């Protein structure tokens, strides 16, 4: 109950934040959310490969 503003700290949530930084990168993301025992875990992969 300690912090005042509570919608979701999307940036304070993440442990490892090393996303592929581009405009055409493709991703996919998996989740496990209980909310009864509290546990939540998220995992997203992203990639890109081009040629010219």
Taking the C-alpha atoms of residue 47 and residue 20, their distance in angstroms, rounded to an integer, is 6
**Nearest-angstrom CA–CA distance, 5 and 22:** 31
Minimum Å distance from CB 17 to its own copies? 7
Asked whether 20 and 46 are in contact (CB, 8 A), the reply is: yes
What is the smallest separation between the CB atom of 52 and its own copies, expressed in angstroms? 15
Pick out residues in 7-46 that bind its own copies (CB under 8 A).
7-8, 15-18, 24, 26-28, 33
Would you count residue 2 as binding its own copies (CB under 8 A)? yes
Provide the minimum distance between the beta carbon of 51 and its own copies in the complex, in angstroms, as a whole number. Answer: 14
């Amino acid at each position: 109950g300690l912090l005042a503003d509570d919608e979701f700290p999307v940036d304070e949530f993440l442990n490892v934040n090393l996303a592929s930084t581009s405009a055409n990168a493709s991703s996919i993301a998996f989740q496990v959310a209980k909310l009864g025992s509290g546990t939540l875990l998220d995992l997203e992969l992203s990639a890109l490969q081009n040629e010219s």
